[PDB]
Amino acid sequence: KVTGRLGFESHFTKQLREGSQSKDYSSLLATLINFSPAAVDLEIRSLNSFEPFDEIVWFIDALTQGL
Amino acid sequence: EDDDDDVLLDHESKTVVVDDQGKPRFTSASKTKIKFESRKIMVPPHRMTPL
Amino acid sequence: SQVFGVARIYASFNDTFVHVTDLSGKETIARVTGGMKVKADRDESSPYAAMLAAQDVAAKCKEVGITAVHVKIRATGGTRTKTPGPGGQAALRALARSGLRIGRIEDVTPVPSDST
Amino acid sequence: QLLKIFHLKTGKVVRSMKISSPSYILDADSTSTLLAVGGTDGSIIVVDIENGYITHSFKGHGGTISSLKFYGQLNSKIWLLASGDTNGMVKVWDLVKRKCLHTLQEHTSAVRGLDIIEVPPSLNLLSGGRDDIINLWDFNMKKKCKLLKTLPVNQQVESC
Amino acid sequence: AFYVEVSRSDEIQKARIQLPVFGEEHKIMEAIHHNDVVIICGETGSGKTTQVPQFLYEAGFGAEDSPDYPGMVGITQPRRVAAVSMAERVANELGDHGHKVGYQIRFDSTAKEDTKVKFMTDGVLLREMMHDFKLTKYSSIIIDEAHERNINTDILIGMLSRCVRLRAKLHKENPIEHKKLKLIIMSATLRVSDFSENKTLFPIAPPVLQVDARQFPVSIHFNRRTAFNYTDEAFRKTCKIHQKLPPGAILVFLTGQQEITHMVKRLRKEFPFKKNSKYNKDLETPVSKMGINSKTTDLEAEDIDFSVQVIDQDKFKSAIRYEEEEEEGFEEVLTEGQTANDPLYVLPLYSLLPTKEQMRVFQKPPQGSRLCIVATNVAETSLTIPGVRYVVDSGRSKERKYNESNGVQSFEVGWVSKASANQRSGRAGRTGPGHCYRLYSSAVFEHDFEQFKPEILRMPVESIVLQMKSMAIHNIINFPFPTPPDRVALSKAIQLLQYLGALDNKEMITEDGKKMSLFPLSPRFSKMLLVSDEKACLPYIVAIVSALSVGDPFINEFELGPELKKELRSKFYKSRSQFSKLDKFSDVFRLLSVVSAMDYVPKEQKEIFMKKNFLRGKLMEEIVKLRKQLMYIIKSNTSKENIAVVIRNEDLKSDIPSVIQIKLLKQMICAGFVDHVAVRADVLFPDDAKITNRTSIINIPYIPVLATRTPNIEDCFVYIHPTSILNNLGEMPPKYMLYYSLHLGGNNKTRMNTLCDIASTPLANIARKGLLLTYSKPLTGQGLKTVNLSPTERYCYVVPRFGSTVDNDLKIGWDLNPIAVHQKKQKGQWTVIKFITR
Ligand SMILES: Nc1ncnc2c1ncn2[C@@H]1O[C@H](COP(=O)(O)OP(=O)(O)O)[C@@H](O)[C@H]1O
């Protein structure tokens, strides 16, 4: 059944887009370390991988700035 | 916050108009049952009460 | 307006015959057997053999022009089984299915009055 | 099961219809795009072949249906159909008004081989048969009459 | 190599010497030898339509022996009647070479074998060029009468400029692997600078030439009045001409096939033959009447109805009110041997004629009978009639007229220009000193006849770029037109076609896009009439699109709105709340039901409903005129039998829709106007909206898609029009509304043209085909899980976002309710196939 207030996107990809426009990913990694591994797999399996590759190169540069 | 529910999915004539190259072209046809058969089978009167 | 043939379906042993005639009896139309469809010599009395035999007879008789068939089942008679085998019902089911109107199913198997 | 194969490089089954009776006579027009087919009961369907489906039904008749013919000149407004028969008759239909033009009961066997032409709407036709009679008619558009019989000694099949 | 020997007959040879197109042939062929793009600025009555391809065959175009030009020759008449008539003409002209001439008028016709100098049609060689972007075959291309500024001519030369550029570029280094391409353009006027000296069309400046002729004196006569029934005016005038005037044939410039056939049968009735041969010839001309060639051919200006026009006598006279017995042209004496009731060799000529009536113009009449043509613009520049002296002109030609943002869109017969009108009048003094009768006054001819416009200006750019996409050219933003339109507007057109589903995100046309491009109508209405062949809603939808295309029927505030005014406004509101209103309160069901009410009325009961329920007579009659024709058009294009369909009466008339059909037509008009949607501002800015019941109903702010949201308040905040059922009842407006267009009122409030209301899900189902909405990731936080079948399938549960709020550069957009989709994983992204019902 439906459920209201599920507005556009979850906080991982929202913070990823905000971090990519803000040139650092520190809060994104602070969330990503924090939340649960089942949820981590559930978001990281769907990273919107298609022809401009924005989300996936943002994730790779986020892990670069992480380690 | 009230969402509706809608699917939104997926006679004849008596004249002609032919073509620019001859070639006539008529309008549509009307629409187009199996049989009326019968079979009689006799019952011997010792299997009558079982029937 | 329909016209009538007569089936004369012969449910013999080791063979099955179907040949519709016009209802005098002289001018036979499309004699087939059970042998001239299957290729094994073991089941030329097959129900399947009689089935496609009756299908081919139905096609040829609709080609000629007869639409209904008074059907007459004959077993081999004599001092023998006196009663139709399976091939008779097989041909009957086939040409009752195959678009042909059926009339007056009978039994014309000969009865001996105690011959030899 | 009626099918049509486009003869060109697309040799696929373009259209496929389920006709009523097993038929044994077909004729396409002198032009293209008209195909008439009549079964072995009384039903003569005609089909526009481009966008292939039924354009006329023509229940009409009686008995199994013998040979038939079109009347086609390119860019006309006449478009008749000939419609022979087994019990001897010729029942001419048009295609622009879906009406039986003239009922003609005169023959004695299967009316094979009939043909339609005009000579100055005159439109003389000629219908042979398995009987030995070729029996041409004047065949006006409103009301028709007869002329000579001229009797060949054959069993005429497709008297062109 | 140089040339092959040609031959012609003696009388056509001396006719070519007598007509002045033989004088400039050597200078033209040397300009062709020295430059490819050659301009000719001739005229009608010269001979340049006929004999210049014969000059090209003389020059060696079509000669296999020349290694420079071994190719085909294509002559591109824009009208297929012109193509076949000039095909048989040059087949007569080349004579013993005359079997080398051919025609190709539709796409299904391919090249005939015996020709090397072949005629064709504009759309025919554009589809030829489309599937042959290289154009190996044709050594030359002849664009005649390109002065008309057709959309086909514009797209034609816009492709042909880059075509001849790339072909010459590949040829000039190597003649073996690449041949030349000689482009030869003609015209009737001399304003060919928009073809030659346009730097966007041609950075390289091409040479311009002339080769015009001579003309006998045309005596032009303008009438003291101007008649309403121009057919009866022209008929009365032409019976007086054939009764009293000296001999010389007649050309009657009139409008359409129906009027022309009526005038031809009336002229044959007035001047009949006793002879059976000529009587049967006129009978054949009256019998062979119509042809359409809907899809598998090129199209012309004989769609014969897309026109919401209307008329009256006070309307005509108020249009020509600047104009404030012995009549001109009635001067010369009737000659002996010419009876007043002479037989007349009458011939119709419209573009929808068969070939065996298109050849009968050029036959000499019986002796004692005078020749006569009743026609339209085919005999203006392409064709010319050998023997006319009197031409008589109604001054009205059927073309495209469309004005914007108000629901006026008509393919109507307007008023012809001054230049084209004088070009029509110049066919009078053509065989001798002739007489043109213009069926109006010279004050009318002064005022409402403009001097010098293109179809690319008269037609919407969305249909223009859809036409280019169906012809499969993709570099449209920088494509060389003579009048390149507004780049803002054509980018909005590409955006609109992406919104409607004609164009994908890589800009290639879809099948639904080609079925839109087949229509001679707007892309929005074409989408409507393509989609609504579902669950018996087509009479309702054709009534709605006919109403929006004809205009407002309701007499509402062009009048009142003390002792009778109150009762009249009260009974007017009662007529609103009567049979105009029974179904809902959205907006447009009244606009459906007033036309559904035109079935509940006998014909002699005609005036009482308009005069009671406040409807306009001519617009209410032309909507029920337009409905039959529009249903004919869309049934002809989408049904399985193209041409042979007919329209009966009750199926254009009516039935009554209950609930499923009103919500289905609601999503149909959503598919019509998917980018003219609007939201109540509580779901974007609930603080600025001030959502209360005592705010007036024309003050609850609405916000459109794709519009910029700057920190000013009233940027997107556009409001409801007073002429809806809101502002009349106004209880609580539903959140998502539709409009047709926007009109700014005097209080700087952009009022609307509101239509209907959707909640979430038919809006999503409509938008799915379009490229409006961008999906989210699968959202299964508290809900039920995504079920897969495969690594490329998905049964997930996603919220859609309408107005593309990803990287929000102020294009305002809103989310929808969550919906279950069925994805397919195309090329890295997850497109959607369908939805899932509950
Ligand atoms: N199909 C045809 N048959 C006979 N004569 C024609 C035909 N078409 C045009 N003509 C005549 O040829 C002459 C030359 O005109 P044409 O070359 O067709 O146009 P333009 O003057 O624009 O070049 C005209 O006077 C016209 O009457």
From Swiss-Prot, chain A:
Superkingdom per UniProt: Eukaryota
Protein's cellular compartments: Nucleus, Nucleolus
Disulfide cross-links: none
Coiled-coil region(s): none
Domains: entry comment: The WD repeats are grouped into two tandem seven-bladed beta-propeller regions.
Complexes and interactors: Interacts with snoRNA U3. Interacts with MPP10. Interacts (via WD repeats) with UTP18. Component of the ribosomal small subunit (SSU) processome composed of at least 40 protein subunits and snoRNA U3.
Miscellaneous comment text of the record: Present with 2020 molecules/cell in log phase SD medium.
Protein role: Involved in nucleolar processing of pre-18S ribosomal RNA and ribosome assembly.
Protein name: U3 small nucleolar RNA-associated protein 21
Organismal lineage: Eukaryota, Fungi, Dikarya, Ascomycota, Saccharomycotina
Portion of the parent chain present: 806 to 872 of 939
Curated annotation (Swiss-Prot), chain C:
Segment forming the signal sequence: none
Gene Ontology terms for molecular function: mRNA binding; structural constituent of ribosome
Location(s), subcellular: Cytoplasm; Nucleus, Nucleolus
GO cellular component terms, semicolon-separated: 90S preribosome; cytosol; cytosolic small ribosomal subunit; nucleolus; nucleoplasm; small-subunit processome
One biological process term in Gene Ontology: cytoplasmic translation
Main location: cytoplasm
Keywords: Acetylation, Cytoplasm, Nucleus, Ribonucleoprotein, Ribosomal protein, Ribosome biogenesis, rRNA processing
Post-translational modification: N-terminally acetylated by acetyltransferase NatA.
Note in the entry: Present with 29600 molecules/cell in log phase SD medium.
Role summary: Component of the ribosome, a large ribonucleoprotein complex responsible for the synthesis of proteins in the cell. The small ribosomal subunit (SSU) binds messenger RNAs (mRNAs) and translates the encoded message by selecting cognate aminoacyl-transfer RNA (tRNA) molecules. The large subunit (LSU) contains the ribosomal catalytic site termed the peptidyl transferase center (PTC), which catalyzes the formation of peptide bonds, thereby polymerizing the amino acids delivered by tRNAs into a polypeptide chain.
Family affiliation: Belongs to the universal ribosomal protein uS11 family.
Protein name: Small ribosomal subunit protein uS11A
Species per Swiss-Prot/TrEMBL record: Saccharomyces cerevisiae (strain ATCC 204508 / S288c)
Taxonomic lineage: Eukaryota, Fungi, Dikarya, Ascomycota, Saccharomycotina
From Swiss-Prot, chain D:
WD repeats: 20-57, 60-105, 109-147
Coiled coil: none
Compartment list: Nucleus, Nucleolus
Quaternary structure and partners: Interacts with snoRNA U3. Interacts with MPP10. Component of the ribosomal small subunit (SSU) processome composed of at least 40 protein subunits and snoRNA U3.
Its biological purpose: Involved in nucleolar processing of pre-18S ribosomal RNA.
Note: Present with 8070 molecules/cell in log phase SD medium.
Protein name: U3 small nucleolar RNA-associated protein 13
Record organism: Saccharomyces cerevisiae (strain ATCC 204508 / S288c) (Baker's yeast)
Gene: UTP13
Residue range from the parent sequence: 83 to 246 of 817
Swiss-Prot record, chain E:
Extra remark: Present with 2000 molecules/cell in log phase SD medium.
Keyword Transcription regulation: no
Organism: Saccharomyces cerevisiae (strain ATCC 204508 / S288c)
Residues of the full protein shown: 373 to 1253 of 1267
GO molecular function annotation: ATP binding; ATP hydrolysis activity; helicase activity; RNA binding; RNA helicase activity
Record key words, sorted: ATP-binding, Helicase, Hydrolase, Nucleotide-binding, Nucleus, Phosphoprotein, Ribonucleoprotein, Ribosome biogenesis, RNA-binding, rRNA processing
Protein name: Probable ATP-dependent RNA helicase DHR1
Domain of life: Eukaryota
Subcellular location per the Swiss-Prot or TrEMBL entry: Nucleus, Nucleolus
Gene: ECM16
